[PDB]
Each structure stands twice: as structure tokens, then as C-alpha cells.
Amino acid sequence: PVQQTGGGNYIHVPLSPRTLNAWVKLVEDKKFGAEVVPGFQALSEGCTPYDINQMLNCVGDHQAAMQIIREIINDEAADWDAQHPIPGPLPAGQLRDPRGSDIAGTTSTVEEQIQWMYRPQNPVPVGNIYRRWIQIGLQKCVRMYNPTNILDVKQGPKEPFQSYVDRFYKSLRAEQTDPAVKNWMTQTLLIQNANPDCKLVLKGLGMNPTLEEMLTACQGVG
Amino acid sequence: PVQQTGGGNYIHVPLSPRTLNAWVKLVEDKKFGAEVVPGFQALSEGCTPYDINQMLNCVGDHQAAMQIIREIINDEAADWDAQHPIPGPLPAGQLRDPRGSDIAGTTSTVEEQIQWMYRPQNPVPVGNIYRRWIQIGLQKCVRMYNPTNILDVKQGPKEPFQSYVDRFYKSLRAEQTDPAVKNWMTQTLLIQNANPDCKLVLKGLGMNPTLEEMLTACQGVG
Ligand SMILES: O=P(O)(O)O[C@H]1[C@H](OP(=O)(O)O)[C@@H](OP(=O)(O)O)[C@H](OP(=O)(O)O)[C@@H](OP(=O)(O)O)[C@H]1OP(=O)(O)O
């Protein structure tokens, strides 16, 4: 992370060992589950690219997922090296502008990452861009390791409607389908895959029942 | 039918044999079913009374129904001979105005029917008036031969709600009851005679559910 010091300059404070150990624990227990994507973001907040590399280096043993996060990073960096091209011959005595690889931290020092992150002129938020690239990689890992598909989720005959709602929305988090497909699933598939009685109360509510109206109506049905 | 020819005058083109044979087929297969009433209208469009008589003469063997269509025609002609009385002594060299019997074509030539149908002054649409009289006769035949009464129609335990709706409305077409009785049947009897589950979803919808709302709610119930 970065702390400001007297003179208006900034320095690097290494991520706490227990901040790194929390990340490890999460990846070892949730197995790249939907929750890992937000868990990574909260534990990587205010981090330079250098620190994000260490967090990944602490969870490298999960090689399959790391290979997926690594192929997504290279592509989001290539797109940065195509749409943010070298401006031209950089003047001497000046830091080069960041390339996709600098945003990652692989070809750049943490100080360079800090100089960009806090440029008085055109600050480049290299830490947040790289966290966004890794979140695309982790979300692809959440989908690949997702244990139950949205379609398979079906309310148990006795299962309370809210727990069936809880499992239905958790699988939808993994789904990478178009947002309209997500809206049609929450409005059509969720009434389609409910136990016989809850299905009669939901159809009873009428057309386009909101989730609050559906949860309120099926509370204690079954 | 009637075609216009050079000089501004009109002539008669005999109904096609296959237009007449379609009519026969329909009456022989639908057995004066609700569908016969519209089927007659489409196959009698732009016909003089003379042609409508031939269509009836092609389906005379159905004597019982023909006797009903014939008693309705005589009464709709008597009402025309009472409310459209002979104006008075007709001038010589002029076509007499049409009487109920002329509208039928029984006491009138097709040319007279055409002269009225296309009078430059007060054209009388004898072909359409007679088609309307026969439709009253066929509709009475649809009701007399109707196999299932609106009340008897009751959704099967597994029957999809739409098929029960299809049979319920087909019997209502035969019903000659006041329109309010028709509106109360479609809004009350249709929910009353549905299988136990669909009846619970329809009551669930609330008061005065539209048919679209009822079909949408019971789709896939049972
Ligand atoms: O009504 P018909 O006396 O039996 O004649 C019909 C009629 O032709 P006309 O319009 O000249 O009367 C058909 O037209 P429609 O009345 O059905 O619209 C036409 O068929 P098209 O729709 O293609 O015009 C068909 O001609 P064909 O079946 O040879 O294609 C022809 O029937 P016939 O000549 O066989 O008697």
C-alpha cells in the first residue's frame, strides 16, 4: 500500500502478513467460489500492482485457476498496449507512461507504479486497473468451478422459498450470461423451478411479481 | 356474382362449381357447427340472392336444418314487407322496389336483384340482407345441433387451462343467451368449472381477471 510522507512524496508500506494470510485462507476454503471475487477486492483495496502480484504468489499452488487469471491479464494488457500506445519518444529525466505490463507490475518497480498512481498531472490508477483485470480472471474461475447450474437449482418439496431463492441467486452470480437472460431467469425460471405449492401462490400474485412480493407471499408455504 | 362491363352496366357470373363444392363439403363435415355460419358468409360474399338459393339447393338433403333456415327467411321477409311496404302505384317502365320475397330471389330475376344491388339512386343490397337472414337460420341450426352445453363444459384434471378455455368459448358461440349472461359466464362460470388447482390460481389473481391474465397464470398448472 502507499502512505504519504513529509515533502508531498509517497512511499510503499508492505501488505500486512495477516492481510495476505486472510487472502490465502479464503482461496483455500471457498475454492474460487463467487465470494472470492469480492473477498479479493476488499483485501486488495489501495494496493499497488506489486502487492497484488504477492497475493497471487501466495495462492500460486492453485495452478489451473492461476493459469486462467494469467491468460486474462495478458489480454487486458495487450488491449491497453493497443488503445493506450506509447505516445512517442519519451523525454529524458521523465518516467515512461505505463504499458499493460507496467499496470501488472511485472516490468515495473513499485515506485514507478506509485509515481503514476499519484502523478500530479495525468495520474494512472495502475493498482485498480490490474485489480479489475484479476476480477475478470477470478470471475471466469468462479464460473468454471461453479458446482450447480442456475437451471438445475429446483426448490425442495419442504425447502423454504427463501433458501431456494438463496441457492437460485448464488448460481446466477456465477452465470456470465447477458443481463437480459439474467432478468428473464429471475422473473420466469425462479417461478418455473419452485415446489408445486409455492408455484401456485406465485402465479396467484399475478404478472411480474417483485422478489420482495414473492418472498412475502411464500413465507411459511410448505 | 356480379362483374361490371363497358357502358356502366353489370352482368351475372355464375358462382364457381368449386366455390359451391367447398360449401357442400363444409356442411357435410361440420354438420351445421358454429364454423358453418362464418364459412357460409365467406363463400357467399358478393353473391346475388339467386346464387345464395343455389348454395342452399346444394345442401337441401339436410332437410331438418333447411326447414329451420326456411322458416327464419319467411319471417325476416314478412318484417321487410311490413316495415318496407309497397311505396304505392309504381310508374310504368320502372323496376318495382324489392319485397321480402324479392330479397330472397324466389319471386325475382337475378337481373332485378342486380338492378337493385347497383341502383344509381337508392341501391338495395338484396344479397347482403338475404345472407343476414340465412345467418340467423344457420345460427339457430348451430344452437339446435350444439353437442355440449356451456354449463356441462368442465376442465379435465390434467387438461391444460387453454384447451378447457377453447371448449368453453366454442359452446358460448352456440349460446343465443343475452350478452350480459355471456359476460357473466366468461367471468364467473369459467373460473367455477376449472380443475381444483387452476381454480385456486384464478381466485389468487383477484377480482375480474382478464382472459389473457388467466391464460398466462394457468399455463403449465396441472
Ligand atoms: O373460381 P374458379 O372459377 O374455380 O377459377 C379459379 C380462380 O380463378 P379466377 O379468379 O379467374 O376465378 C382462382 O382464383 P381465386 O378465385 O381462388 O382467387 C384461380 O387460382 P389463383 O388464386 O391462382 O388465381 C384458379 O386458377 P388455377 O387453379 O388454375 O391456378 C381458378 O381455378 P380453375 O381455373 O382451375 O377452375
d(CA B36, CA B39): 5
Task: Estimate to the nearest angstrom the gap between the alpha carbon of A185 and the chain centroid.
Answer: 22
C-alpha dist (Å) from residue A37 to A50, A55, A168: 19, 13, 18
The answer for residues whose C-beta is within 8 angstroms of residue A28's C-beta and 6 or more apart is: A59
Nearest-Cα residue of chain A relative to residue B205: A204
Chain B residues inside the 8 Å CB shell of A203: 201, 204, 217-218, 221
Task: Specify the amino acid at residue A22.
Answer: A
Nearest residue (by CA) to ligand 1, atom 35, is B18
Query: What spacing in Å lies between the alpha carbon of B117 and ligand 1's midpoint?
Result: 25
User: What torsion, rounded to 10 degrees, do the Cα atoms A143, A149, A155, A159 define?
Assistant: -40
Q: Quick one: cell of A13?
A: 508500506
How far is CA B115 from its chain centroid? 26
What separation in Å is there between the alpha carbon of B15 and the centre of ligand 1? 12
Q: Measure CB to CB from residue B204 to each of A192, A203, A207 and give the nearest one.
A: A203
Pairing outcome for strands B2-4 and B10-12: antiparallel
How far is CA A211 from each of CA A23, A169, B141, rounded to the nearest angstrom?
33, 11, 53
Residue with cell 465470494: A35
A200 and B201: CB-CB below 8 Å? yes
At A11 the three-state DSSP class reads strand
DSSP A96: P
Strand partners, B10: B4
- Is the Cβ pair A203, B201 closer than 8 Å? yes
Q: Quick one: which of A46, A43, A38, A37 has its CA closest to A55?
A: A43
Three-class DSSP labels, B72-117: HHHHHHHHHHHHCCCCCCCCCCCCCCCCHHHHHCCCCCHHHHHHHH
As a whole number of angstroms, the distance between CA A161 and CA A180 comes to 23
- As a whole number of angstroms, the distance between CA B146 and CA A71 comes to 72
| Cβ atoms of A102 and A127 closer than 8 Å | no
Among A179, A174, A171, smallest CA distance to A153 is for: A171
Q: In sequence order, what are the residues at sequence separation of 6 or more whose Cβ sits closer than 8 angstroms to the Cβ of residue B153?
A: B164, B167, B168, B171, B193
- What is the best residue among B2, B3, B15, B16 to mutate for testing ligand 1's pocket, by most ligand atoms within 8 Å of CB? B16
Q: Is A97 left (phi over 0), alpha (psi -120 to 50) or beta?
A: beta
SS3 A27: helix
How distant, in Å, are the alpha carbons of A89, A169, B138, B151, B153 from that of B35? 85, 50, 10, 20, 19
Resolution in A: 2.0
Q: Please say whether the beta carbons of B98 and B108 come within 8 A.
A: yes
Place of cell 502512505: A3
Sign of CA dihedral B157, B159, B160, B164: negative
As a whole number of angstroms, the distance between CA B90 and CA B77 comes to 20
C-alpha dihedral sign at A48, A51, A53, A55? negative
Alpha carbon of B209: minimum distance to chain A alpha carbons (Å): 10
Determine which of B195, B197, B199 to mutate to test the interface with A (most A C-beta atoms within 10 Å).
B197
Angle at B1 between CA B59 and CA B44, to 5 degrees: 40
Strand (E) positions, B15-169? Answer: none
Which residues in chain B are closer than 8 Å to A192, comparing Cβ atoms? 220
Alpha helices in chain B (DSSP H): 17-29, 36-43, 49-58, 63-83, 100-104, 110-117, 126-145, 161-174, 179-184, 190-192, 196-205, 211-218
- The set of cell numbers assigned to A124 is 494512472
B95 contact partners, CB below 8 Å, separation of at least 6:
B112, B115, B116
Say whether B204 and A207 touch across the interface (CB within 8 A).
no
Surface-to-core class of residue A138, CB atoms within 10 Å of its CB (0-12 exposed, 13-18 middle, 19+ buried): buried
The residue written with cell numbers 500530479 in the block is: A120
- Whether A2 and A11 have beta carbons less than 8 Å apart is answered as yes
Q: Is the dihedral of CA B67, B72, B75, B81 positive or negative?
A: negative
Express the helix, strand and coil content of chain A in percent, nearest 5 each.
60, 5, 40
Q: Strand A10-12 and strand A2-4: pairing?
A: antiparallel
Q: Which residue, B134, B146, B143, B145, is CA-closest to B69?
A: B134
Question: Contact, B156 vs B164, CB < 8 A?
Answer: yes
Q: Which of B2, B15, B18 to mutate to test the pocket of ligand 1 (most atoms within 8 A of CB)?
A: B18
Closest CA to A49 of A96, A117, A95: A117
Query: Does residue A2 sit in helix, strand or coil?
Result: strand
The candidate with the shortest Cα–Cα distance to A86, out of A98, A77, A74, is A98
For residue B204, the chain A residue with the least C-alpha distance is A204
